[PDB]
Amino acid sequence: MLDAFSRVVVNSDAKAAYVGGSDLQALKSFIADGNKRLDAVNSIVSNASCMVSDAVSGMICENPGLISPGGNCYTNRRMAACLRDGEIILRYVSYALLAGDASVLEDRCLNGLKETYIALGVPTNSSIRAVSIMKAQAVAFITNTATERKMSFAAGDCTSLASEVASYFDRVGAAIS
Amino acid sequence: MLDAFSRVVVNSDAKAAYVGGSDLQALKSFIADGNKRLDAVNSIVSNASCMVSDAVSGMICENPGLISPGGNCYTNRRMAACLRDGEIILRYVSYALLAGDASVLEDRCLNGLKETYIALGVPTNSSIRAVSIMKAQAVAFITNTATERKMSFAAGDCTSLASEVASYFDRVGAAIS
Amino acid sequence: ADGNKRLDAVNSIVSNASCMVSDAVSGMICENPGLISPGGNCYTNRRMAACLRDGEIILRYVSYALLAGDASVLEDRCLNGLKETYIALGVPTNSSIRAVSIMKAQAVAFITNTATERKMSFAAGDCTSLASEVASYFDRVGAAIS
Amino acid sequence: VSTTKADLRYVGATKPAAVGGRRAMNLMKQQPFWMYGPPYNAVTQDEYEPISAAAPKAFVDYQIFAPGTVKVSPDSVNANELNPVSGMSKYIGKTQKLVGDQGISDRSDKLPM
Amino acid sequence: MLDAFAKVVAQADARGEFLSNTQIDALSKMVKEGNQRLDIVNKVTSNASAIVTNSARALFAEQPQLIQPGGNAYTSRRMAACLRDMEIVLRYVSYAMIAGDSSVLDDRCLNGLRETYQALGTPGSSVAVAIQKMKDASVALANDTTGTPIGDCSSLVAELAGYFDRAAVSVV
Amino acid sequence: MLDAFAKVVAQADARGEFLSNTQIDALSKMVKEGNQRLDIVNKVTSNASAIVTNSARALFAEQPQLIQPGGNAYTSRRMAACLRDMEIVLRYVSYAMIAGDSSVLDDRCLNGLRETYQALGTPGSSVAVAIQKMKDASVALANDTTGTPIGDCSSLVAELAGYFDRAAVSVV
Amino acid sequence: MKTPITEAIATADNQGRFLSNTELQAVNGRYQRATASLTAAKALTGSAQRLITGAAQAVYNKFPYTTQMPGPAYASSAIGKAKCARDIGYYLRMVTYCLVVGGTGPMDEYLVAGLEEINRSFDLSPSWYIEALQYIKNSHGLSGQVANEANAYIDYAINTLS
Amino acid sequence: MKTPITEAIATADNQGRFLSNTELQAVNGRYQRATASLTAAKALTGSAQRLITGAAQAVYNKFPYTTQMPGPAYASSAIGKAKCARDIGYYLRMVTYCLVVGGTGPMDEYLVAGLEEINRSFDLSPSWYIEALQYIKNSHGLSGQVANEANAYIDYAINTLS
Amino acid sequence: VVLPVARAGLAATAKKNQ
Ligand SMILES: *C(=C)C1=C(C)[C@@H](Cc2[nH]c(/C=C3N=C(/C=C4\NC(=O)[C@H](C)[C@H]4[C@@H](*)C)C(C)=C\3CCC(=O)O)c(CCC(=O)O)c2C)NC1=O
Ligand SMILES: *CC[C@H]1/C(=C/c2[nH]c(/C=C3N=C(/C=C4\NC(=O)C(CC)=C4C)C(C)=C\3CCC(=O)O)c(CCC(=O)O)c2C)NC(=O)[C@@H]1C
Ligand SMILES: *[C@@H](C)[C@H]1/C(=C/C2=NC(=C\c3[nH]c(C[C@H]4NC(=O)C(C=C)=C4C)c(C)c3CCC(=O)O)/C(CCC(=O)O)=C2C)NC(=O)[C@@H]1C
Ligand SMILES: *[C@@H](C)[C@H]1/C(=C/C2=NC(=C\c3[nH]c(C[C@H]4NC(=O)C(C=C)=C4C)c(C)c3CCC(=O)O)/C(CCC(=O)O)=C2C)NC(=O)[C@@H]1C
Ligand SMILES: *[C@@H](C)[C@H]1/C(=C/C2=NC(=C\c3[nH]c(C[C@H]4NC(=O)C(C=C)=C4C)c(C)c3CCC(=O)O)/C(CCC(=O)O)=C2C)NC(=O)[C@@H]1C
Ligand SMILES: *[C@@H](C)[C@H]1/C(=C/C2=NC(=C\c3[nH]c(C[C@H]4NC(=O)C(C=C)=C4C)c(C)c3CCC(=O)O)/C(CCC(=O)O)=C2C)NC(=O)[C@@H]1C
Ligand SMILES: *[C@H](C)[C@H]1/C(=C/C2=NC(=C\c3[nH]c(C[C@H]4NC(=O)C(C=C)=C4C)c(C)c3CCC(=O)O)/C(CCC(=O)O)=C2C)NC(=O)[C@@H]1C
Ligand SMILES: *[C@H](C)[C@H]1/C(=C/C2=NC(=C\c3[nH]c(C[C@H]4NC(=O)C(C=C)=C4C)c(C)c3CCC(=O)O)/C(CCC(=O)O)=C2C)NC(=O)[C@@H]1C
Ligand SMILES: *[C@H](C)[C@H]1/C(=C/C2=NC(=C\c3[nH]c(C[C@H]4NC(=O)C(C=C)=C4C)c(C)c3CCC(=O)O)/C(CCC(=O)O)=C2C)NC(=O)[C@@H]1C
Ligand SMILES: *[C@H](C)[C@H]1/C(=C/C2=NC(=C\c3[nH]c(C[C@H]4NC(=O)C(C=C)=C4C)c(C)c3CCC(=O)O)/C(CCC(=O)O)=C2C)NC(=O)[C@@H]1C
Ligand SMILES: *[C@H](C)[C@H]1/C(=C/C2=NC(=C\c3[nH]c(C[C@H]4NC(=O)C(C=C)=C4C)c(C)c3CCC(=O)O)/C(CCC(=O)O)=C2C)NC(=O)[C@@H]1C
Ligand SMILES: *[C@H](C)[C@H]1/C(=C/c2[nH]c(/C=C3N=C(/C=C4\NC(=O)C(CC)=C4C)C(C)=C\3CCC(=O)O)c(CCC(=O)O)c2C)NC(=O)[C@@H]1C
Ligand SMILES: *[C@H](C)[C@H]1/C(=C/c2[nH]c(/C=C3N=C(/C=C4\NC(=O)C(CC)=C4C)C(C)=C\3CCC(=O)O)c(CCC(=O)O)c2C)NC(=O)[C@@H]1C
Ligand SMILES: C=CC1=C(C)[C@@H](Cc2[nH]c(/C=C3N=C(/C=C4\NC(=O)[C@H](C)[C@H]4CC)C(C)=C\3CCC(=O)O)c(CCC(=O)O)c2C)NC1=O
């Protein structure tokens, strides 16, 4: 598990160089934005239970065959596991937003999720369709354009943290494809 | 409040600019298609009493628990207040279509509407459904594709007025959600 | 050739069409009002709306066979089973010929302009050959049911 | 262990739809009453009929009859059977499709037309 | 593949035995049906397009989410592949009816069909409803006379129903 | 294979939606840039041999164990395969630049390049050093004019460097 | 997906080469044409409800047996009338996708691949859909090259049905 | 040509071996069935013009727009009616050819291969011919196994048109 | 999939003058 600081040391260890100079000036501007990243992880963890129950319900309203007899989200034992399967994905994305590096997402959650879901009979078309709803919710909460709740932040721009959290949620969908 | 000409001069006041011939070609086509804007708003206010009662009773049709004991359109006291409210919403979006800017709908009608409804107990998912019926009633009178009531127009497209008024009806759902 | 009398004979029917089948099947209720009694079969909302649909469709067939000018448009399947469809659903068929014979008497009233409510402008001349043709076409529908 | 009227329904779906006519939708069976609901939206058989599209221009006037011959009758004279406290009403509104029967129909009565 | 006559031969070669006198008398009964088996295969094949299409028509009346945008039969390539699969299953059920043995049915259609629909996301509970609708369209077509001499075929329609139930449990 | 225009059409068809007026306007901003995207790609492919060769020569001067006898790029077979692997990654980045979307990049170059090099024994740490050398040789080549109308292209050269960053974290 | 952008990339990938000026000129022609293509897509989207319900009536007036004949294949019932207008809206939606993308790639993938087998199975006639597509070609009201762009995908759909 | 004799020679020539009793029993089944197949060929041939004239009249009653609509694809002229009765004779003649040789061989080569390319081009509805083949199936007057042999190749022609 | 530092050091180098 690497964070954003461990990545620039592994890259410098391959050539056996001391960290200094231009990549020390790229690191001082990563911490200048370090409060925006801390402001924005909090704006997702605070809304984490409504983000999941809206994404699972919105996957169901698009494909109501999942709640038919024989559907994958049919019984109460299987409905409670999709609500659990879908908030572990959101939990591991919030680790990657706090760390600033998608290493912990890629190996503790995504490595082998596709082979697991097509061994339990889980439709990977619908799992992509719930992950893409959680992508639209996380970009709305970070840019503070939710229609259901407006948070309080200092004034400024956080469109690079929205580009980063959309890249993590696009990977999740590309991995379980 | 503002209209479509006042919206341009408050954009230029942030730059202390002059409204010159680059900016004036949007306003020279607002007056060029200005006959069709008037031709579209008496297509709506000529049918406004039929539009409200169909949208409110069409919301009762898809949700019959609104008129059972414990619904919030139950008695004559509550049903006349729902019929009054859908006439107020249709009045303010006819002001906004006439001006060409959704300022007067957003500060007088929609500002603070979400807090009235969660204090009076008004269901907001079915209230969005009554607005979304009369959005579809409004685009059918403008493009003259209603099943009864063919009005007498002149020939051409009013397809940018029908989607301008569909965005004014979409702001009502975004403000009470 | 003279098809202007033919086109006036179609337009005297197809303009006053929705009054005619409204006055056809309400006169069918007016001669026996057991069909709109509960237990009758023009009683419900779907059954009353279907009965106006069939008289419109029969008037669509007669006004199209008048416009073509031959009974080959009345050679369609609708002819077979209109007796057997109305037997199998359970439909008073002798009441349905009463619905057609009002429309037979209405269509000769509109063609000859001897309608005692409405009086329309035409040219001078005769149109009784075409009024016998619609009396020929309505009895072919009146023989398809029995 | 099939029953004789259980299929006599099912033989009409074996013909093609140009010669089977209405009988081509005979294979759909009775869904449960919540399957016609607004998440699922199972289509009833009567739509596949022309009896859903009975929308005429003409209309009976009902004032030209003699007084006493137009009869009407409500379903129940009760506030609580026409509409409960929930919206599950059998008579009022869009919840009249949520009946446990009335999914299939008898259109093997007529013809293969 | 191997039919019902070859099935008892393969069971007897692995024991190294001649066939019994009882076993020949049981294969005389399978030839004695003979023409009644060929009537069921004739009736099912002759109405093969109408059985597939009218039981797809009745599936989309009861499960109309399959043809909504985001459903598994919404597009032309995804609808035409759905009718193609329902004709594949009806083909190998008629192959298993003329042979008297469900060996071509699973070795050439069914083995690997559950693995295919789990890698694609095809709803397996809706495929078995389409299989069960071709079943009772065909077991009602089996026991109608329509130019056949009158007799009892109730033992051969229990065999045809058992091939539809076998194809339905290999996908659900 | 999706470009940037087809990325939003495919996402609309999964819900059955027409594209809205705010999505057509975001796509016409890409047509508005247009000529400046075509000069990012023209500057990269017209110096493609110098970008790869100067980044390989600098890679072996930093990790000299790769070209030692017994190293992973000893024996001309392995040396020539190391050079076209660098030109493969630079090719698909220039594909993903002209499309506006990284679909052709991580579907048919990067999808399974971490576990390709892991099965071969190729050090994927050292491959990522080679992507980073071709990265800043290309962004130093993108933001110079040298016969080019002067303007601001910094939102496009931040997109080109993000494709190189996407390839770098994917191989290790 | 067959776009002018992804036909250029697929040309260079089948030859194993970088994007030369043969492929940069093909992309540049899409950008020169995307002005008229993206205003045609806006004007057909805003006229959607007018063009769909008007073109369903054009089929019912030319083929009036399609409202009388019983059976599941005809617009004689509530769900056949609903499925006929749904299919005009599928055709209008794919034309707007083709104008945005810039080629006959969405409707090759979503619409025409497997369309002949569907019409023959469900007994739908392709002369019905040609008549509704001739109405949309004569009622969008566009002019100039904006009409030239919209018409070129409407009679691409006509040549696959006829 | 798919006959039961050529499909037995082909399964023995494919592996390069002489004919055995696997193949002799297949040709024997053709000979035992050709008793009923050749009386149905005499009967449909003698009743040809009774069945071509009557089946053309059944399409004009099921689909009466075909005699009313103008256009080259419709039987609303003297020329278009002459080509419609020509088409019923082609379908009836291929059925009698199939009864002679014992397989669905002659209508594969002469009627089925290339059929939907023609019905798409010349705008012919394939349900016009299903109603014509259903008239012949209900009014040839055959019975016993003579009817089962004639209906089995008539029903094959309906399956390729749908 | 993104590098935050390597992309947070290039965006601050072209906007801020040297
Ligand atoms: C009682 C309930 C009742 C009837 C019974 C039935 C009486 C009736 N009226 C006619 C004759 C006509 N109906 C016509 C149709 C119309 N009149 C109009 O002018 C408008 C256009 C249209 C609908 C209102 C017409 C034109 C006639 C001929 C009248 C004339 O001579 O001018 C019949 C048919 C004749 C018969 O067989 O008796 C019947 C049965 N209507 C009732 O309300
Ligand atoms: C109404 C049917 C249900 C349904 C079917 C469906 N299937 C597919 C795709 C494939 N099915 C197969 C299976 C076979 N192919 C064969 O040739 C044989 C004979 C031995 C079998 C058993 C294969 C290989 C495919 C994929 C290739 C293709 O045909 O395109 C699809 C398409 C899935 C897709 O993503 O394109 C559908 C829709 N799906 C339903 O919804 C119905 C319940
Ligand atoms: C939870 C109560 C949060 C919250 C989450 C947000 N959801 C946002 C958008 C959104 N939600 C859905 C699912 C919804 N749509 C449906 O059609 C159905 C049922 C059939 C459901 C449950 C969808 C599809 C989308 C849009 C995805 C897209 O844009 O493509 C969202 C975005 C902005 C906003 O709504 O303000 C958020 C923040 N919203 C809340 O207010 C609470 C805190
Ligand atoms: C008054 C009658 C006007 C008129 C108004 C229009 N209403 C239109 C659409 C519409 N109406 C309803 C409600 C209706 N449907 C129901 O199921 C019930 C009862 C439960 C009722 C009362 C709905 C649901 C809709 C469709 C909206 C949607 O699709 O979401 C309408 C649209 C055009 C059209 O119908 O084609 C108009 C113009 N119609 C008139 O002509 C008079 C003037
Ligand atoms: C789209 C909504 C219609 C359609 C609209 C058109 N209307 C056009 C011209 C037009 N409309 C009016 C009446 C309007 N102007 C007023 O000043 C007042 C009230 C004080 C009203 C109600 C007028 C006077 C005109 C101008 C033509 C004339 O003088 O007769 C029009 C022509 C374009 C233009 O000149 O702006 C169009 C396309 N026609 C349609 O087909 C749809 C359904
Ligand atoms: C940032 C990447 C560059 C830069 C780029 C600019 N190029 C501008 C205009 C322009 N570019 C081209 C060539 C381009 N079009 C092609 O079709 C092909 C290959 C087939 C290429 C390489 C042309 C023909 C034009 C003229 C377009 C026009 O103006 O009509 C441009 C616009 C100028 C401006 O508005 O400022 C920019 C900014 N400029 C830079 O400084 C960096 C190095
Ligand atoms: C919901 C959005 C999905 C869906 C989810 C289901 N998942 C089910 C079981 C399950 N899920 C996982 C993976 C999960 N565990 C993890 O540790 C991580 C990340 C690190 C994830 C994503 C596993 C390993 C299992 C099986 C073991 C277990 O459940 O304890 C499941 C139940 C299947 C069953 O009961 O047999 C469901 C329903 N299914 C859906 O339909 C939507 C699309
Ligand atoms: C009908 C579509 C709704 C619904 C409506 C009810 N509204 C009730 C009271 C109410 N509504 C408003 C907002 C309205 N008045 C305005 O002045 C403006 C903007 C200019 C708007 C939008 C207000 C301010 C009030 C309270 C004032 C008053 O009525 O004295 C109401 C009565 C509640 C009660 O009796 O306790 C109802 C039933 N309710 C519904 O269920 C549908 C969805
Ligand atoms: C018969 C039911 C009427 C009647 C009919 C006559 N109409 C005569 C001439 C005539 N009719 C029309 C209208 C008709 N022709 C058309 O082309 C079309 C529509 C496309 C229609 C509806 C016209 C235009 C004319 C020509 C004279 C004029 O301008 O009105 C007519 C004289 C024969 C002739 O010269 O054609 C007759 C007898 N007259 C009757 O007395 C009964 C009631
Ligand atoms: C009305 C004056 C009658 C009457 C009519 C009813 N007909 C009902 C159903 C029905 N009607 C027809 C015939 C009609 N349809 C056609 O396509 C053609 C011509 C080609 C005609 C003349 C058919 C085929 C059907 C069945 C199909 C369907 O239901 O849509 C009907 C409903 C019966 C029911 O289900 O209860 C009624 C009430 N019945 C009367 O009492 C008066 C005499
Ligand atoms: C059972 C599902 C049926 C039914 C079947 C019977 N068929 C009987 C005799 C029979 N069937 C055929 C046709 C068949 N033989 C062939 O060679 C070919 C094609 C190559 C086919 C389709 C023939 C020729 C015969 C005559 C042999 C004979 O008569 O024994 C039959 C025997 C009648 C009896 O013994 O009672 C039965 C029972 N009959 C039914 O009622 C159900 C529906
Ligand atoms: C309307 C103008 C005419 C008409 C329409 C009609 N169509 C159907 C059925 C189908 N249409 C399609 C076509 C598509 N599906 C797609 O997903 C796409 C691409 C996005 C296309 C072009 C399909 C697959 C069907 C069958 C699916 C279904 O059953 O709904 C019907 C119903 C036919 C039936 O047998 O159910 C109707 C009535 N028919 C008319 O009469 C009008 C003239
Ligand atoms: C009559 C049932 C309906 C009808 C017939 C009709 N058909 C045509 C045109 C053609 N028919 C064929 C078919 C065949 N030709 C063959 O050689 C064979 C196999 C032996 C078949 C099945 C072809 C090829 C044509 C077009 C070329 C030609 O005309 O020879 C027409 C004329 C259409 C036209 O000329 O474009 C007509 C009228 N149409 C109906 O309305 C009847 C219901
Ligand atoms: C341990 C708990 C803990 C936290 C929750 C954060 C809380 C936090 N956020 C910001 C500070 C900020 N936060 C934002 C973020 C945003 N502003 C917007 O307009 C967007 C909607 C949103 C996400 C882009 C911005 C723009 C600043 C201004 C300072 C900066 O640019 O870094 C600051 C510094 C400014 C101040 O002191 O007020 C702090 C302490 N830090 C912590 O230590």
Can you tell me the distance from the alpha carbon of B88 to that of B104, in angstroms, rounded to the nearest whole number? 13
Can you tell me the distance from the alpha carbon of F126 to that of C9, in angstroms, rounded to the nearest whole number? 92
Backbone phi, psi, residue H54, to 5°: -75, -30
Can you tell me the distance from the alpha carbon of H50 to that of H58, in angstroms, rounded to the nearest whole number? 12
Radius of gyration of chain B (CA): 18
User: Token match 């770098």: residue?
Assistant: F168
List, in order, residues 6 or more apart from D1 with CB less than 8 Å away.
none
Q: Taking every pair of C-alpha atoms in chain I, what is the biggest distance, in angstroms?
A: 29
Taking CB atoms and a 6 Å cutoff, what residues make up the pocket around ligand 8?
A: B 56, 66, 72-73, 77-78, 81-82, 85-86, 88, 109, 113, 116, 120, 122-123, 126-127, 130
b/e map D88-113, b = 16+ CB within 10 Å = ebbebbbbebbeeeebbbebbebbbb
Interface size D-H, in CB pairs within 8 Å, comes to 11
b/e map C116-127, b = 16+ CB within 10 Å = eeeeeeeeeeeb
Nearest to A163 by CA among A1, A59, A36: A36
Can you tell me the distance from the alpha carbon of E37 to that of E158, in angstroms, rounded to the nearest whole number? 12
Chain H closest CA to C75's CA: distance in Å? 5
Q: Is F164 exposed, middle or buried (0-12, 13-18, 19+ CB in 10 A)?
A: buried
Of E53, E57, E79, the CB nearest to G114: E79
Chain D closest CA to A88's CA: distance in Å? 27
Chain B closest CA to D55's CA: distance in Å? 12
Concatenating the DSSP letter of every residue in D10-69 gives TTTTSS-HHHHGGGGGTT--PPPTTTTSTTT-PPPTGGGSTTTT---S----SSSSPTT-
Helix (H, G, I), strand (E, B) or coil at C38: strand
Contact between chain I and chain C (3 or more Cβ pairs less than 8 Å apart): no
SS3 labels along B61-128: HCCHHHCCCCCCCCCHHHHHHHHHHHHHHHHHHHHHHHHCCCHHHHHHHCCCHHHHHHHHCCCHHHHH
Cβ distance H148 to E47 less than 8 Å, yes or no, reads no
Nearest to G153 by CA among G91, G88, G92, G95: G95
User: Which stretch of DSSP H or E encloses residue F39?
Assistant: helix F37-45
Find residue C38's DSSP bridge partners.
C40
Can you tell me the distance from the alpha carbon of B27 to that of B14, in angstroms, rounded to the nearest whole number? 19
Single-letter code of the amino acid located at B45: V
What's the G72 CA to ligand 12 centre distance in angstroms? 10
Nearest chain D residue to C37 by CA: give it.
D71
CA distances from E168 to C130, D6, E41, H157 (A): 64, 20, 20, 30
Cβ distance D58 to C81 less than 8 Å, yes or no, reads no
Token duo for residue G81: 């009338």
Nearest to D51 by CA among G136, C46, A3: C46
Nearest to A23 by CA among G115, D86, I3, C107: I3
Token duo for residue E110: 């069914």
Radius of gyration of chain F (CA): 18
* Chain H contact residues (CB < 8 Å to G): 63, 65, 116, 120-121, 123, 125-127, 161-162
Can you tell me the distance from the alpha carbon of E35 to that of A135, in angstroms, rounded to the nearest whole number? 64
Token duo for residue E115: 């693995």
Nearest chain E residue to H151 by CA: give it.
E46
Phi-psi region of H64 (alpha: psi -120 to 50; beta: other; left: phi over 0): alpha
Can you tell me the distance from the alpha carbon of F111 to that of A174, in angstroms, rounded to the nearest whole number? 10
> In CATH, what number does B1-177 get?
1.10.490.20
Q: Is B25 exposed, middle or buried (0-12, 13-18, 19+ CB in 10 A)?
A: exposed
| B58, D74 Cβ separation under 8 angstroms | no
Q: Is B73 annotated as a binding residue?
A: no
User: Token match 């997402």: residue?
Assistant: A105
Can you tell me the distance from the alpha carbon of A7 to that of A27, in angstroms, rounded to the nearest whole number? 11
Single-letter code of the amino acid located at D51: I
Q: Is B158 annotated as a binding residue?
A: yes
| B101, B3 Cβ separation under 8 angstroms | yes
Helix (H, G, I), strand (E, B) or coil at A112: coil
List, in order, residues 6 or more apart from D18 with CB less than 8 Å away.
G71, G73, G123, H127, H130, H131, H162
Q: Angle A124-142/A159-175 helices, nearest 10 degrees?
A: 170
Chain F closest CA to A95's CA: distance in Å? 17
Task: State the DSSP code for B2.
Answer: -
Can you tell me the distance from the alpha carbon of A165 to that of A10, in angstroms, rounded to the nearest whole number? 23
Task: State the DSSP code for G65.
Answer: G
Experimental method, per PDB record: cryo-EM
End-to-end, the C-alpha distance of chain B in Å comes to: 24
Can you tell me the distance from the alpha carbon of C34 to that of C39, in angstroms, rounded to the nearest whole number? 8
Backbone phi, psi, residue A47, to 5°: -115, 25
| H104, H31 Cβ separation under 8 angstroms | no
Which residues of chain E make contact with A119, given a CB cutoff of 8 A? 118
Q: Is C43 exposed, middle or buried (0-12, 13-18, 19+ CB in 10 A)?
A: middle
Cβ distance E46 to H151 less than 8 Å, yes or no, reads yes
Can you tell me the distance from the alpha carbon of H133 to that of B156, in angstroms, rounded to the nearest whole number? 50
Q: In testing the pocket of ligand 10, which one of G65, G66, G67, G68 has its CB within 8 Å of the most ligand atoms?
A: G68
Q: How many Cα atoms are found within 13 Å in the side-chain-facing hemisphere of E125?
A: 14
Backbone phi, psi, residue B112, to 5°: 85, 5
| B168, B90 Cβ separation under 8 angstroms | no
Single-letter code of the amino acid located at F88: I
C1-146: CATH topology is: Globin-like (1.10.490)
| C13, C110 Cβ separation under 8 angstroms | yes
| H111, H97 Cβ separation under 8 angstroms | no
Token duo for residue H54: 């009557």
Helix (H, G, I), strand (E, B) or coil at D78: coil
Known binding residues of E: 35, 39, 72, 77, 82-88, 153
Find residue C40's DSSP bridge partners.
C38
Cβ distance A11 to F128 less than 8 Å, yes or no, reads yes
The structure was resolved to a resolution in Å of 3.3
| B10, B104 Cβ separation under 8 angstroms | no
Residues 4-33 (H) with a CB less than 8 A from some CB of C? none
Backbone phi, psi, residue C38, to 5°: -70, 125
Can you tell me the distance from the alpha carbon of B127 to that of C17, in angstroms, rounded to the nearest whole number? 42
User: Token match 């619908």: residue?
Assistant: A126
Nearest to A66 by CA among A133, A130, A132, A131: A130
Token duo for residue D84: 């409960």
Can you tell me the distance from the alpha carbon of H1 to that of A87, in angstroms, rounded to the nearest whole number? 64
